[PDB]
Amino acid sequence: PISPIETVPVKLKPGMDGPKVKQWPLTEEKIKALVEICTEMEKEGKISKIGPENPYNTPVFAIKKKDSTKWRKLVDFRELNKRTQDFWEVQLGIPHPAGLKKKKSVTVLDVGDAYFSVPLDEDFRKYTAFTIPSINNETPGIRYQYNVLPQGWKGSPAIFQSSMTKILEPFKKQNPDIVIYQYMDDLYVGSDLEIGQHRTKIEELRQHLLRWGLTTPDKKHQKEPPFLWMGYELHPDKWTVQPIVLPEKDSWTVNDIQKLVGKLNWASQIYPGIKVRQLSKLLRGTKALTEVIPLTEEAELELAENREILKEPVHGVYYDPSKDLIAEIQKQGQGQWTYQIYQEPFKNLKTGKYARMRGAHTNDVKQLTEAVQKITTESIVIWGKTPKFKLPIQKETWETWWTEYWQATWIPEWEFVNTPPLVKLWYQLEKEPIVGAETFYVDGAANRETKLGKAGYVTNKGRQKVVPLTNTTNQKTELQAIYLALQDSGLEVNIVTDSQYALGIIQAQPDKSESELVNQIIEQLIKKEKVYLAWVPAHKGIGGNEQVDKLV
Amino acid sequence: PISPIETVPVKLKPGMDGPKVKQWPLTEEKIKALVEICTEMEKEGKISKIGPENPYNTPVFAIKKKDSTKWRKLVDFRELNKRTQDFWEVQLGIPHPAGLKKKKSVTVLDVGDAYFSVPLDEDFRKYTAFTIPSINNETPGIRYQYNVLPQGWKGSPAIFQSSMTKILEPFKKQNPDIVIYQYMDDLYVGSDLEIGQHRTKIEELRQHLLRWGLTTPDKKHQKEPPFLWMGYELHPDKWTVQPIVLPEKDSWTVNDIQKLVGKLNWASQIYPGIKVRQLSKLLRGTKALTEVIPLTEEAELELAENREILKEPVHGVYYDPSKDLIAEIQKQGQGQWTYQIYQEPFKNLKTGKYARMRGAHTNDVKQLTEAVQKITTESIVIWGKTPKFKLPIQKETWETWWTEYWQATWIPEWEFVNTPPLVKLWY
Ligand SMILES: Cc1cc(C#N)cc(C)c1Oc1nc(Nc2ccc(C#N)cc2)nc(CO)c1Br
Ligand SMILES: [Mg+2]
């Protein structure tokens, strides 16, 4: 029940000092209950009657939930915790199955009885002092002081997993075949022995632990081959997700809409095409938890296109450090990209998606890059290496673009994989003006308050126009201006603008943006033979806005 | 009394609590390096294992020593620095000689090895703790913390400063014209001797340090020259102004003069005395673009005129030691990059250009990691302090690959910028 483990010396924050809160309501039936657990506790050395002298108290509560055959002691260390130094956080993350090695037999041990076995820094004890109120006659209550890690204390999970790891270390050495992993109240053991030999090692480990005062159990209500790990359905040579539940309903609300998406994503680790752009878009309403939201058309279709997918159970394989890691990416459309990492072209290792939630204007190639990146990170975290990539884009494309782009990117090793769609450059602005082409001097202001604007051009030819627009902005007009010139120009044109805005947006060659206007522009750009853009300062350059502005 | 010293009491700024920076995850290759490298330090007593009561944590990587046989443990004490050395930039500042930039040649040696003799104040250690990660979170990190002034923490130099000067002094004597600047892990020696002498004077120094405890690895090669370039040899008396070139053209076209008007147009707030109007007047017309057109009244006058106030640097361009230095970098393509190191907008303390080579061998994220270590060092020399880089790269990409070509023992401060506009044209 208690081990001869060295203790992690502990301290209370800088200036502070132990807590002095109390609680004194005595229900006989419980003061007994506690003094009960307490006597069987002290007996087991886990606590100690303390003589009135400097102690600091803490709340004592008695509990019995459902199926109560016994009671349960419970102290509230909230006020103590708020006074103890911080510790080294562990378990921030969980190993992800897609990178687990195929092991044969397995066994999860129960180590909850745990923290009550590890010692408490001899000196930090005085603070743990709690007091069970005895005679209501306001008599010197039977007072104790913890000797092992208290159930709620701050430094407990920490000082525990610590002590643990230290106890496994030796056993881990003389048994390099026996892989262990601990997570809180548990201690999972996986090996390549046959269920017999395996239940041997388990016994040794079991004994080993016990010598260290850490007592473990032999049976309880659990299960076998599948394993229920945090959300993963774990099988000996395959893993996959515990059956998910996409609920259908009448009125949906944010709280629900979120809980849906979240469930949806989780499935993505392995369900090939899971899509989510639409169902998420419906949460622009960054507010109401109960504000019922209409599953407006676009969403529904998606959700269902997902129901058909979960509809057919699929699982995954493990990591073979011997074989190669690969990654393929396929574009889906609305800025969504799917991928799956594997070693063998058939069943998967893990899959994933990448959506561009970065605003308004983007590019397929770029996105492709962003995807790749996302994955390389994950791969490093999971496998600790960098998959060879398989991507729907040809060097004469990629290379050309990283050659143009003002930012610097860097894709790792990649092999082209011809399969629709296909990342490419739907157009290219000409670098030098066009000899012979009509020069359109576009422009177009807007009234910031009246919201009334104009957009027009004037060509070298002396071909003019102005088109009335309402409910628009300096930006909207400025583009509409570039959309106009484009419209009214021939298969070749030299366009001149004043907005660094309009310009930039066109230069990146956005494959798309839902901003139909930009699109309208984008498409005209594709239909043209040759285009040339030019930027010239606003309030003091050319001499063409004015003659149209004076009109506006 | 431990053979080398007795701890120098360290105290971080009040209201300041130790670092708690997360550990980037790494490659298995890299973990194993560190795992070995640390089991060594561990043995040599250099470092120990820590418990759960050490909530502190500074990052670590593994880099290629000098494109060598084995690895190097590179700690990113960037946080612990801000939290300490800033008041050890005071309580123990290491004075920066404004003439070294003048020397004809500056060699850079790595003294990072001496520190490991000096034991770190018994109480500050807890802060220099770092953690080697694990793949797929299967195992709790490994936790080591220092016991000797560690390399990288801008506090070792300050502590060791004492003992340095002493070791140096009897060479700074026989050699009173040579300047020796200590900056963290490295020594920067300057001299106006013909190289051949210099190089020798350096090794003449290298052995002086050596026969006095300190060990400098800087032995790049021997008699056999596999076209491998000798030690770090900068030449700061050539650290002059970069070229902002307008083009003298055979023929001028609406477009050419169009753009030209732009460049000049914004140089406007670098030098508030540039006039375009005389040029901007020939474009007030809505003429074709391929069309060729000539001068205006004082056009030619204004071209060669502003061509001038341009070749003559600015004003109010003095260095503010109280402020921070800032380096902006922009891709030029085909291996070329450019940079400015200002403190406030358009008052550039300096600018330059970096260029690697041609295709087959280099990628962007190498040029940038080098253009960076280049600009850092010019900066260390000139102002005795590294700048904060406004990098034109996607945060995560950089975050992923910078180590991949990083050779410097120190790490600057950086942030990313998704927009470098009209600036590329200009420079
Ligand atoms: C992640 C995990 C979960 C459970 C739990 N629960 C038990 C153990 C021991 C575990 O560790 C590992 N598991 C596996 N594969 C594994 C395969 C199938 C099944 C089943 N059924 C369980 C584990 N491989 C590695 C190697 O790296 C580790 Br480490
Ligand atoms: Mg205008």
CATH number, position B136 = 3.10.10.10
Q: How many domains would you assign to chain A?
A: 5
Domain-terminating residue out of A124, A140, A156? A156
Q: Are A449 and B304 in contact (CB under 8 A)?
A: no
Domain check: are B217 and B302 in the same one? no
Are both B117 and B36 inside the same structural domain?
Answer: no
Residues B69 and B157 in one domain: yes
How far does B19 lie from chain A, in Å, by closest CA? Answer: 12
Closest C-alpha to A236, from A281, A274, A190: A190
In what helix (H) or strand (E) does residue B131 lie, and over which residues does it extend?
strand B129-132
Whether residue A226 is preceded by a cis peptide bond, meaning omega within 30 degrees of 0, is yes
Handedness of CA A233, A235, A239, A243 (dihedral sign): negative
The helix/strand count (H/E) of chain B reads as: 9, 14
Give B394→chain A minimum CA distance, Å: 7
The answer to whether residues A401 and A425 touch, using CB atoms and an 8 Å cutoff, is yes
- One-letter amino acid for residue A3 of the chain: S
Q: Do A541 and B283 make contact, defined as CB atoms within 8 angstroms?
A: yes
Tell me the nearest-neighbour CA distance from B137 into chain A, angstroms. Answer: 5
Q: Is A384 on the interface with B (CB under 8 A)?
A: yes
Cβ–Cβ < 8 Å for A157, A90: yes
Which residue among B319, B346, B362 closes a domain? B319
Pocket residues for ligand 1 (CB within 6 Å)?
A 95, 100-101, 103, 106, 108, 179, 181, 188-190, 225-227, 229, 234-236; B 138
| Residue A406 distance to chain B (closest CA, Å) | 6
Give yes or no for A538 touching B (CB within 8 A).
Answer: no
Is B4 a member of any domain?
Answer: no
Helix (H) or strand (E) holding A62: strand A60-63
Range A75-78, long-range pairs (CB < 8 A, 24+ positions): A75/A130, A75/A150, A75/A151, A75/A152, A76/A152, A77/A150, A77/A152, A77/A153, A77/A154, A78/A152
d(CA B185, CA B111): 6
Which residues in chain A (313-372) have CB-CB distances under 8 A to chain B?
A: 369-370
For B275, the token pair is 């006039």
Q: Are residues A351 and A277 in the same domain?
A: no
Is B177 annotated as contributing to ligand binding? Answer: no
Cross-strand partners of B109: B187
Q: Residue A202, by phi and psi: left (phi above 0), alpha (psi -120 to 50) or beta?
A: alpha
The reply to whether B3 falls in a domain is: no
Asked if B296 and B242 sit in the same domain, the reply is yes
In angstroms and rounded to an integer, the radius of gyration of the C-alpha atoms of chain B is 25
Residues B271 and B341 in one domain: no
* Boundary-marking domain end, from A295, A319, A343: A319
Within this chain, do residues B154 and B215 fall inside the same structural domain, yes or no?
A: no
Instruction: Tell me, in angstroms, the distance from the centre of ligand 1 to residue A182's CA.
Output: 11
Contacts of residue B52 in chain A, CB cutoff 8 Å? 8, 87-88, 155, 158-159, 161-162
Ligand 1 atom with the smallest distance to the CA of A97 is: 1
Mutate which: B57, B58, B138, vs A, most A CBs within 10 A: B138
Q: Are A179 and A94 in contact (CB under 8 A)?
A: no
Q: CATH code at A446? A: 3.30.420.10
Same domain? B266 vs B172: no
Residues in chain A: 552
Residue B299 lies in a domain: yes
d(CA B151, CA B73): 10
The CATH number of residue A256's host domain is 3.30.70.270
Do residues A151 and A2 share a domain? yes
Distance to chain A for B56, nearest Cα, Å:
7
| Contact yes or no for B331 and A382 at CB 8 A | no
- Who's near A507: CB < 8 A, 6+ residues apart? A429, A533
DSSP A77: T
B313 lies in some domain: yes
CA distance A163 to B75: 27
Please give the structure tokens belonging to residue A288. Answer: 């109401």
Percent helix, strand and coil across chain B, each to the nearest 5: 30, 20, 50
Q: What is the C-alpha to C-alpha distance for residues B79 and B73, in angstroms, rounded to an integer?
A: 17
B110 assigned binding-site residue? yes
Contact check, Cβ <8 Å, B289/A534: yes
Q: Compute, in degrees rounded to 10, the torsion defined by CA atoms A306, A308, A309, A312.
A: 150
For residue A273, which of A209, A339, A224 has the smallest C-alpha distance?
A339
Judge if A16 and A149 occupy the same domain: yes
Let me know the angle formed at the C-alpha of B343 by B340 and B346, rounded to the nearest 5 degrees. Answer: 60
A474-488 and A500-507 helices, crossing angle to 10°: 60
Give break positions in chain A: residue before each, C–N beyond 2.5 Å: none
A500 touching chain B per CB within 8 A: yes
Q: Which ligand is nearest to the CA of A108?
A: 1
Measured CA to CA in angstroms, residue A26 lies from A36, A62, B422 at distances of: 14, 11, 78
How many of the other CB atoms lie within 10 Å of CB of A53? 6
Number of domains observed in the structure of chain B: 4
Residue closest to A256 by CA, chosen among A284, A230, A295: A295
Say whether both B271 and B313 belong to one domain: yes
Which ligand sits closest to the CA of A235? 1
**Contact list, B33 vs chain A (CB under 8 Å):** none
Instruction: Give domain status of residue B199, yes or no.
Output: yes
Residues A219 and A230 in one domain: no
H-helix segments, B48-144: 78-83
Q: Are residues B51 and B67 in the same domain?
A: yes
Instruction: Give the domain extent around A353.
Output: 320-426
Q: Please check if A549 is assigned to a binding site.
A: yes
- Residues from chain B that touch A435, judged by Cβ atoms under 8 A, are 290
Site from B26, B50, B137 to mutate, A interface, most A CB atoms within 10 angstroms: B137
What domain range includes position B169?
99-123+165-233
Q: How far is CA B407 from CA B65, B78, B410, in A?
A: 7, 16, 9
Distance CA(A216)–CA(A210), nearest Å, equals: 7
Joined together, the tokens standing for residue A78 give 């909230």
User: A533 in helix, strand or coil?
Assistant: strand
Cα torsion B235, B236, B237, B240 to 10°: value is 120
Give one word for B255, left, alpha or beta, with left for phi > 0 and alpha for psi -120 to 50.
alpha
The alpha carbon of A375 and the centre of ligand 1 are apart by a number of angstroms equal to: 23
Sign of the four-CA dihedral A370, A372, A376, A378: positive
Pair A1, A117: CB distance under 8 Å: yes
The answer to whether residues A79 and A172 belong to one domain is no
Claim to verify: residue B385 and residue B421 sit in the same structural domain: yes
Q: How far apart are CA B289 and CA A440, in angstroms?
A: 10
Distance between CA B283 and CA B221 in Å, rounded?
A: 61
In this structure, are residues A442 and A548 in contact, taking their beta carbons and an 8 Å threshold? Answer: no
> What is the rounded CA–CA span in Å between residue B8 and residue B159?
7
> Which atom of ligand 1 is the closest one to the Cα of A226?
21
Give contacts of B 265-284 with A, CB under 8 A. Answer: 265, 276-277, 280, 283-284
Find which of B28, B134, B135, B277 to mutate to test the A interface (most A CBs within 10 Å of its CB).
B135
Q: List C-alpha distances in Å: A314 to A124, A242, A309, B347, B392.
A: 52, 11, 9, 62, 42
- Identify the CATH number of the domain in which residue A142 sits: 3.10.10.10
Q: Are residues A38 and A165 in the same domain?
A: no
Residue B373 lies in a domain: yes
Please calculate the CA angle B72-B78-B84 and round it to the nearest 5 degrees: 120
CATH number at residue B114: 3.30.70.270
CA–CA separation, A313 vs A327, rounded Å?
22
Residues A137 and A171 in one domain: no
- A142 shares a domain with A7: yes
Q: What are residue A467's DSSP bridge partners?
A: A455
User: Method used for this model?
Assistant: X-ray
Q: Please check whether residue B371 lies inside any domain of the structure.
A: yes
In terms of domains, do A353 and A386 share one? yes
Same domain flag for B41 and B130: yes
CB-CB: which of A181, A376, A383 is closest to B135?
A383
Cβ pair A536:B283 closer than 8 A: yes
Q: Taking CB atoms and an 8 Å cut-off, how many pairs form between chains A and B?
A: 167
Q: Please, which residues have CB within 8 angstroms of residue A253's CB and are 6 or more apart in sequence?
A: A288, A289, A290, A291, A292, A293
Looking at the structure, tell me whether residues B241 and B359 fall in a common domain: no
Does residue A503 share a domain with residue A442? yes
Cα–Cα distances in Å, from A235 out to A272, A341, A408, B371?
Answer: 20, 19, 43, 50
Give a yes or no: residue B56 inside a domain.
yes
* Whether residue A395 is found in the same domain as residue A327: yes
| A243 & A270 share domain | yes
Whether the link from the prior residue into A421 is cis, omega within 30° of 0, is: yes
Q: Ligand 2 centre from A442 Cα, in Å?
A: 8
Nearest ligand, measured from the Cα of A442: 2
Token pair, residue A207, equals: 């004994």
One-letter amino acid identity for A47? I
Over the range A126-160, which residues count as b (16 or more CB within 10 Å of their CB) and which as e? ebbbbbbbbeeeeeebbbbbbbbbbeebbbbbbbb
Task: Write the DSSP assignment of A339-373 as a string of letters.
Answer: EEEESSSSS-SEEEEEE--S-S-B-HHHHHHHHHH
Of A92, A494, A504, the CB nearest to B289: A494
How far, in Å, is the centroid of ligand 1 from the Cα of A207? 22
